[PDB]
Structures are given as structure tokens and as C-alpha cells.
Amino acid sequence: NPSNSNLQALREELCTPGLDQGHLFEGWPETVDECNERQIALLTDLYMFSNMYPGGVAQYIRNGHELLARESEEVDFAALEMPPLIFEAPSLHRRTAERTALENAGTAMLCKTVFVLVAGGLGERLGYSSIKVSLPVETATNTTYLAYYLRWAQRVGGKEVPFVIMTSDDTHDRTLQLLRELQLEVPNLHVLKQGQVFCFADSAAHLALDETGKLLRKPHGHGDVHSLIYNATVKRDVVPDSGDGTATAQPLVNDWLAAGYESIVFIQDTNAGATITIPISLALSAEHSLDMNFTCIPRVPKEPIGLLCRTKKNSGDPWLVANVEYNVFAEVSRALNKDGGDEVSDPTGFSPFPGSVNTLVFKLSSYVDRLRESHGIVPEFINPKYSDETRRSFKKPARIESLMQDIALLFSEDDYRVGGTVFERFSYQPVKNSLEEAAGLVAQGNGAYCAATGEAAFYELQRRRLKAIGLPLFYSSQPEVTVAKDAFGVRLFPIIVLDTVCASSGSLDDLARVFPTPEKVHIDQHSTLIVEGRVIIESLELYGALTIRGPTDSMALPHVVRNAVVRNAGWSVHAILSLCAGRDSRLSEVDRIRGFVLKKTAMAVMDC
């Protein structure tokens, strides 16, 4: 496609005033026909950047200039208030009539929901060299986040549930490898890889080169999903899929709407609470006719999560319900000395506005309308990392970024209802920080949000849900293992893990189908109970570790467990000692990032 004439034209265009990329061509011959392979390759990289970015490298440089201009200024909002449409979600551990009605409504709507997972990000910050969706949700069964999300979606929306995964050059191959290794067969899964974008060596938007004289590339952010969704097409067989000149053959959102789907949900890579959040949010979206629903928790003022606010950036601008990122809100709080009030905004211990968890719930029709109008394009930003305190020198080359929640900026208050649902903080269980960062954050009285806290929170969530339906679990709240040089402790036991065949959607009703007489099931605080397949447990006395396996098919007749008594050594947990020799280390980085290992000393199995 790119001829030598067009490559020379682009080179001349990029050397013009306002673009000033002549440093890319130092010592090069005048003509393209006289240039060698590495130069042709660099011009071709510049030329075909236009395929993945609107307007190509020249428009990328102009946008960079606009964004670095905007970033040099102190951000100001004309008006910043509580969103009009805020709704308080009921407790996930209380089986109230409202909770039952919302869970059942949400579970019904999950049959008509599209799921999107943003998994383009690296997790090297954790000390984990592999992809984040490969992390286990818990080490009792070692179920990956990828498997957890896909199996839950296929359980609530059938085998042919529409599922989208955004990948990157860093995660794509390994994501597909994991799908193969887990032997996960998802007929309507679409894996869309986001393209990296060029970087700016300086504040004048001069394109950066790497160590080998090639154009440095960096992620454009999780805002890439919408455009990736907008340009996505599908083709099957014996179906009316006309190849339009836009692309062959049919737009993917067209196939969704034609199939009868009514909602779309966006989730992130390492937050299991989404399976508890999504159904309630969906029900509340239907009850209050929300076009877009932000999943929110009460925010502590020192928290690396954004805040959902009603905003007007300029005095003439209309009201916009949108997310303000943590850094921007810190800068805004430092300013506005005479903003109106007596004392600092903290009368309850939490930020005035709720914290956005970035589990987004859209009405599919409204989402498609705004996606078609915007082509998936969302407002961009840039946030360079400077070396000196004031000197405008970049420590690392910078890149334009985007946020997938910023699509809310395309939703006018006149035509659309945009709101937020506030859940308990315990429902937000991400794995974002390493053990060192977690110890540092705990020293300041903040949330760890590490692998050990994520696994412990998963076990506690299962225990709280089961107690909500009357399972009499008596256990201590004292930690059983200290991690990160005795900085903080977590507890894991009792461990109770039910698979998607057993627990179905994970609703309280579905859990009550597994324990129809919960007063006759006595699980000791040190016990482990793994349940796989179609199992019903009527009566059980468990002192140790037990795996109950049932039929892998959901509609198969269930294995019923009555009057069972199991006693064995069961499992323990111990911390990873600093004095570990490291030779014959069966200790992987999965063990090392949580700071403990489970000893599976004994385990009973009931099959059939």
C-alpha cells in the first residue's frame, strides 16, 4: 500500500513547521529511492500508524501539542457537585427482600448482557512476570481470573454468551495460550488487540526512538475498547452477513442488537467482586432507567481511585456526570481556597463523592448510539513523568492516554441518564500492589490491595455469602499468617470454594439450592471444602479438607450428600521465610507475591 512517493511526501510533511520531526532523518539521503531498509521500515511505521490512529502520526503530534499545552495549565472546574442519580446498593451479606428482588432481576438480565474485559495491562508492578488474568483468584483451586470471568459469563448467559477481551502486544499471545491450556471453548468470544502509540521525547512532541533507533511505543490506555468494538466485525455461515464497504461483513454491535441483547458490562482484569456487583447494578439500571451506571464504593481521601462527580469545566458548559481521576481531584482540592464552606470536605471520613471502581454498566442501545456517533473515539490526555521538581525534562518518554470511563463525556444530561451505584468497600477486591507497596500503604493506614488481601477477601466473600443463607460458620477474625516482614496479617480459613456448576450465578437463591438445610452443615473454622459440579449438600460435619465432585453437566441429575462425616489433617498456611535457601525452590512468583503458601497435607474426595 505505501509507495515510495507517499513515504517521501509524509517525510516532507513531518519536517514542516508545527511537526518538526527532522531529527528522525539525520544524515539520510534526499530521495526515498536512495534510502536503505531500516529507513524504509521507519517511514513505513510512520505511514501505517494512520491505520490504527485517526489522522495518523501528524494528527497524533498535533494532539500531543494540544495535550501538553493543556497539561502545563492547572486544571479547574467551573462547577463540581454530587451526581443527581446516586443509588445505595443493599448489603451483599444480608438476605433482605430488596436484595433478593434485585439479585433475581439482575440474574434475569444477565441472560441479555454482553461482557467486555480490559486485559491489555502489565502487572510487573506486582512482581509478577506473566499476564494479570493468569493470576489465581485463590490458590485453593488455582482458578485464574480469565477462567473465573469466562465461566461465570457462560453460566449466566449460556455457552454462546457474547464476550470481548481487549489485549495488547504485551498480553495477546499469552492470553490465547491460556485459553488453549484451560481448554475453554467460548463460541462468541472476540479477542481484540489494541495498538501501541508513539512516544514524545520532549515537551515539543518530538517522537522518541529506542536503543536500536526504532520508534518507541507505549500503551494508549484502556479507552481503546470502544474504537476496537466500533471497527469489530463478525462472519459465521448460512447467515445474512453482507460485506459493506465499511468492512466485511457485519458490525459486531449490530449482531449483538439483532440477537436481542440489551446491556453491556465492562470489567477489569483482577477484581472478582464484579460477579457480585454486576447483577445488582443491572437491576438498578432497569429500575431507574440509567443509560450508564458507574460502580462505586465509599472513597477514603487518600485512595488511588477516581471519583464520580457532576462537573462543568467551563461556566457556559452543561452538566456532565463523569469520573475525575485521583491526581486531578488532589490538584483541584489543593486549589479553590474560597470554594465555599467552613472546613475541609471530610465530615464522614469518606470523600464527598463516591469512588468509581470502573465496572461500567451500559444500556446497549444508548452505548451503540454514542459509539456510532463518536466512532469509539474518547477524549484523550497526557501525564508525563518529569525528572526535576520544576524543570520540564522527561524522565521517561511520554504517550497520549485514554480512559474507557471517559465515554461518559459523550452522554448529555438532556438526552441520557448517567448515574452511579454505591456498594460496600469489601466488594472492591483488586490485586494492584506488590507486598512492599502494600506494607508501605498499611503503615499509613491504607488498603493493601495485594495478592494476599485479594485471596483472603475472596474466601471471606464466600463465607459471608454462605452465612447470608443461614450456614452456621463460626470462625475467628484473627489472622493466621503474617506477610511482608510481619507488616500485616491475613486469614484464609475456613476455605469454601464452589464452582459455577455448583453455585450457578452465585446468587443467594443459587447458593440456597446447594444448602437446602444449612443448619445441618457444620464446617469447622480450619476446614477446606471444594465443591465441583452439580452437588447438593444436605448434612455434613467437616473437620479437615474435602473435595466433593459432581456431574460436569449443569442439567445432569445432582449428587446429594447426606449425613457425611469427614475428619483428616486438612490444610495449613505458612509464610514464606526470608531465610529461604532458594535451591529446589518450588516457590513460584505466584506464591512470592502473596507471601504465604498453602500446605495441602490431606484431602478426602467424594465422587459420583
Ligand SMILES: O=c1ccn([C@@H]2O[C@H](COP(=O)(O)OP(=O)(O)O[C@H]3O[C@H](CO)[C@@H](O)[C@H](O)[C@H]3O)[C@@H](O)[C@H]2O)c(=O)[nH]1
Ligand atoms: O492500555 C491499557 C491500560 C490498562 N488496561 C486495563 O485497564 C484496567 C485498569 O488498569 P489499572 O492500571 O489497574 O487501573 P487504572 O487505569 O490505573 O485505574 C482504573 O481503575 C480504577 C479502579 O481500579 C478506577 O478507579 C480508575 O478510574 C480507572 O481509571 C486493567 O484491567 C488493565 O489491564 C488495558 O487493557 N490497556
